[PDB]
């Protein structure tokens, strides 16, 4: 790294600084003065202070990119968001008067919730006991399950079963199926849940 340890990561939150001094707690107040002395890294290009910035939709874009082609990864994401948006408007005009109150049209709310329905609760971790490795069920951390949800969605879409379907139409179709707790990505979570509940006899090998 070209940055020294002294350099600290920057805080892009715009409503944090605005906080009145009267609200500042004694601990928080101290921090603010301390940062003045510290050196701050230059903010990276990826994250701004806009009101539309979504860390989950930016991380999902980075996990699809190939060879640094971010203009194409971002393009696919926005097309997918627009495809989810246009498909729900088509399901909203053709619905009954009382069915329109339960139809979500915001593509973000669908993206975040669909990924939350794929997050597994427990996983299989190899533990060394008696000179052997056992795939014991272990509670996946918050980050791990958030990462797996994204990886599985991108693997399923990349999988070459759909002969000639564009990613935006594939990713949009999988996101709407997981929103209703359907599809393979959800099924893939159950298959990991069926192997952690069959091998529960080895749930004492772990210590932490």
């Amino acid at each position: 790294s070209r940055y020294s340890p002294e350099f600290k990561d920057p805080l892009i939150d715009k409503e944090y600084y605005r906080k009145p001094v009267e609200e500042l707690t004694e601990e928080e107040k101290y921090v603010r003065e301390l940062k003045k002395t510290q050196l701050i890294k230059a903010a990276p290009a990826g994250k701004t202070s806009s009101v539309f910035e979504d860390p989950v939709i930016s991380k999902f874009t980075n996990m699809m990119m190939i060879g640094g082609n971010k203009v194409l990864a971002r393009s696919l994401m926005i097309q997918t968001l627009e495809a989810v948006k246009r498909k729900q408007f088509e399901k909203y005009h053709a619905a009954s008067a009382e069915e329109q109150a339960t139809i979500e049209r915001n593509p973000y709310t669908i993206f975040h919730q669909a990924l939350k329905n794929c997050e597994p609760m427990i996983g299989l971790v190899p533990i060394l006991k008696g000179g052997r490795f056992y795939q014991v069920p272990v509670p996946l951390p918050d980050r791990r399950r958030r990462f797996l949800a994204m990886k599985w969605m991108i693997t399923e879409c990349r999988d070459k079963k759909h002969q000639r379907t564009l990613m935006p139409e594939k990713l949009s179709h999988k996101l709407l199926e997981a929103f209703h707790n359907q599809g393979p990505v959800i099924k893939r979570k159950h298959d990991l849940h069926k192997m952690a509940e069959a091998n529960r006899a080895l749930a004492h090998y772990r210590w932490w």
Partner: protein, 117 residues
Amino acid sequence: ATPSLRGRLARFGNPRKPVLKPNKPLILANRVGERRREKGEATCITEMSVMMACWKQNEFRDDACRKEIQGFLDCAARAQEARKMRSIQETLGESGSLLPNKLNKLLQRFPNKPYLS
């Protein structure tokens, strides 16, 4: 009351048969052993058994077993903090017995002398 050592080891004055056959001389050392890593206690197992029993009944649906999952989730969070707190605090915090590294600095100030000078 430390057990006796009269007429225990094979010697010249002792007429009777030996009682003890030590492979290492019975002479105090100037250091103690390092505390051995234990095994640990698995946590959130009861929350993990009632959450996987609900999936079988409900065919692994996360909409009917929501309450059970939180027990297993909230527990993991609390258990994770305890592990971090325990490791750091025990070494830094002074409770009960001392640690070998600090206890061997005390035994090396008062070394055992099995020789004459």
